[PDB]
Design a protein around this ligand. Structure first.
Ligand SMILES: NC(=O)C1=CN([C@@H]2O[C@H](COP(=O)(O)OP(=O)(O)OC[C@H]3O[C@@H](n4cnc5c(N)ncnc54)[C@H](OP(=O)(O)O)[C@@H]3O)[C@@H](O)[C@H]2O)C=CC1
Ligand SMILES: NC(=O)C1=CN([C@@H]2O[C@H](COP(=O)(O)OP(=O)(O)OC[C@H]3O[C@@H](n4cnc5c(N)ncnc54)[C@H](OP(=O)(O)O)[C@@H]3O)[C@@H](O)[C@H]2O)C=CC1
Ligand SMILES: CC(=O)N(O)CCCP(=O)(O)O
Ligand SMILES: CC(=O)N(O)CCCP(=O)(O)O
Ligand SMILES: [Mg+2]
Ligand SMILES: [Mg+2]
Lengths: 396, 396
């Protein structure tokens, strides 16, 4: 029986993780948990799973303790902030860490888990997009089991030769691999015209037709910046250069991604769209874990389609590939700019079409440099956020 | 550099094997080869690949030597019959045996290769359908590397957990597997009406829309007895009971077959329809072998469809499942009946619709018994051939 620390338990990924862990209390206990604003959901979670430690930002500690007071919930240690996130992500008594915080805020805890040699289920893709080879080299230097939860990357992991982890990291495919096809749903506005793209509303962006998710990844999916981020993520996780990864639009989102081989083989992972599958896989790897996700029924889902992405209508993809080829702090700049642009759009301060625009501007305005350390990364991230906020405010 | 004995080199599989081996003369040399009627094609093959030994039936030896005389081809040992087939399939100097003979005639050589502990590339599916657990137990008892060449079974092999070979053979899936989906093109007459089914001609049966193959497997594909045989084959190769294998019609024949997992995962192998891919895989496993098969392009092959087989319109499928559940000598009876029924149809002695009919009759007429030995199997095969020939002759 292994202990789990869930970072961002109240979110979409956190809740799918809770489902799986609740089906297997004999294999997994919950030791630590973190939330950022959904405090009463967190209290109910605490009742059901009785963690030893919980974390919230400082400006919520009070509101949480008062709640714990009502339910007469005692015995739960309460820590605050990024510092509590790191402490629980690298805790002596934790065995597995689900990194399900959203965006850059998850970088320090996640990396911490990596440096403590935990089994790290990487859902927070932004952390890897920011830290790249630092996080990967740290996983290797501390024997951290860094397993992908992002559905495409889990699909690729499952479609690679089984010991691909221990292969020569050279940027070049290995062991017969020749290409990776990174599937994409194309977002809810795949077939929208530029006219309606210009006037998309937040509610529309957030309603994904296949996956029920948080707002940030919903928008990124509508915008195809999610797929840009996932291209960067795949390049780091599997240590491959970007021009070996090909994006494929697949509206049904039943095939999750593909690996192609030098003998003409293409291996795939597919299934009903339910993050519980890849969560269970990463959690139990190398063992398979029973879940309640129904078996894929191809008589009901009897058609699958594919097509090339429209990188003129969704320029975020070429921006991400850009950052990747540039390397260094380019993915960090991109990620920070996109974070505050998505934020500004969700707050109806900017139009949908403007989201990539601010990203591009930031990337053209702020200059790149080597990703030498986490300090440098956080620094460049702050500066990119500033540049992007300024550009925004100058367009209304 | 390893030596290869190709059984049935002149056929479709034999020629794809020749393509691959010709691209890699530094890794593979051809030591032995066999043909049954295409003698001058065989002589040209001998020129190009210079085997040490060739085999043909006795009633062709003369015709071959005369040919060798013309070209002044010497140094090639000539053996005759099933006995020469066994001798070359188990030869001290052979390392790999491609079992690409068609039908029951390939049983003794193939099994021989298995008993000599060679790496056996199993294309001749009839041999396994006949001999089942005898052949599998012999592969295990002699450490024969028995690798599937049949495209669906190669796809499944690639989609299983990687050490599935060493798992507990119990008829029950293992290591998280929950189902196998055995894809089927549905044949050229998938959407034909019973009226036109009744008057299908041999030329029509033989023209497969995806794969260029021999006549027997072409007919079996039109008839869906190929898929019956492949259900039996899968059950033996992966040691699973039949009710875990689900047939899926997939007209584009781009997905080759699938394995489903208890976490909701489905793993797949897909690619352009070219037997060179699975041949190369089985030949080089566990290493990947470069081939000239073009990479699968999902922008060109941009649609995939699936549907349930019509086992009322193609009753050969339920007949095969029948034989499998019955066990013992039931697959042998089925296979022999189908062999001479397909033969009679190709010789315009019977109508297409009659093919399964004779099979069924034979299975109802001849009684089952345990598959105790190869002797018993050959015996029951002869008796089934006799029963089927009699039934045929009694319908014109
Ligand atoms: N949801 C999905 O299906 C998929 C998501 N992912 C990745 O998983 C990560 C989270 O996904 P998702 O569940 O959709 O997002 P959510 O918004 O639903 O959840 C985010 C979680 O992080 C916490 N959080 C939010 N902001 C902060 C902050 N400054 N500091 C600390 N914690 C914070 C939230 O707490 P609270 O709820 O209390 O505000 C919440 O627990 C993301 O990186 C996403 O890209 C990957 C592929 C699939
Ligand atoms: N072709 C394909 O794409 C696929 C075929 N397979 C399997 O591979 C096997 C052969 O396939 P295929 O190439 O299509 O069939 P073919 O008819 O094209 O070739 C059969 C081979 O076996 C030889 N042969 C035929 N009859 C006899 C006999 N009594 N005794 C000894 N040898 C004989 C042929 O010699 P000759 O040419 O001189 O007459 C020929 O070399 C079959 O079991 C088939 O089911 C599996 C899946 C794909
Ligand atoms: C399930 C998953 O892994 N996602 O990243 C959700 C978005 C899928 P897409 O970006 O719309 O293809
Ligand atoms: C390529 C292969 O493995 N075959 O058995 C050919 C027939 C394919 P189907 O039986 O028509 O699906
Ligand atoms: Mg994803
Ligand atoms: Mg086949």
């Amino acid at each position: 029986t292994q202990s789990v620390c869930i970072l961002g338990v109240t979110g979409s990924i956190g809740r799918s993780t809770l489902k799986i862990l609740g089906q297997h209390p004999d294999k997994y206990s919950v030791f630590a948990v973190s939330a950022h604003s959904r405090i009463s959901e967190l209290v109910e979670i605490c009742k059901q799973f009785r963690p030893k430690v919980v974390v919230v930002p400082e400006q919520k500690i009070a509101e949480l303790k008062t709640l714990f007071a009502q339910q007469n919930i005692s015995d739960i240690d309460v820590l605050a902030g990024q510092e509590g996130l790191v402490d629980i992500a690298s805790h002596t008594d934790v065995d597995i860490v689900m990194a399900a915080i959203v965006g850059a805020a998850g970088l320090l805890p996640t990396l911490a888990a990596v440096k403590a040699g935990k089994r790290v289920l990487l859902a927070n893709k932004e952390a890897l997009v920011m830290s790249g080879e630092i996080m990967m080299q740290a996983a290797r230097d501390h024997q951290a089991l860094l397993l992908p939860v992002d559905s495409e990357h889990n699909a690729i992991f499952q479609s690679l030769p089984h010991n691909y982890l221990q292969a020569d990291r050279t940027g070049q495919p290995q062991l017969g691999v020749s290409k990776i096809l990174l599937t994409a749903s194309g977002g809810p506005f795949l077939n929208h015209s530029l006219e309606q793209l210009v006037h998309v509303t937040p509610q529309q962006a957030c309603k994904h037709p296949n996956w029920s998710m948080g707002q940030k990844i919903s928008v990124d999916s509508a915008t195809l910046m999610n797929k840009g981020l996932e291209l960067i993520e795949a390049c780091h996780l599997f240590s491959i250069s970007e021009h070996f990864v090909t994006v494929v639009v697949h509206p049904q989102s039943i095939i999750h991604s593909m690996v192609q081989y030098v003998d003409g083989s293409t291996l795939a992972q597919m299934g009903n769209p339910d993050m519980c599958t890849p969560i269970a896989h990463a959690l139990a790897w190398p063992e398979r874990l029973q879940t309640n996700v129904p078996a894929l029924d191809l008589f009901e889902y009897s058609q699958l389609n594919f097509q090339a992405p429209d990188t003129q209508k969704f320029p975020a993809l070429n921006l991400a590939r850009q950052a990747m080829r540039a390397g260094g702090l380019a993915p960090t700049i991109l990620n920070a700019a996109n974070e505050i642009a998505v934020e500004a759009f969700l707050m109806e301060r900017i139009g949908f079409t403007s989201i990539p625009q601010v990203v591009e501007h930031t990337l053209e305005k702020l200059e790149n440099a080597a990703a030498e350390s986490i300090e440098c990364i956080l620094d460049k991230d702050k500066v990119a956020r500033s540049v992007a906020q300024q550009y925004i405010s100058s367009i209304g």
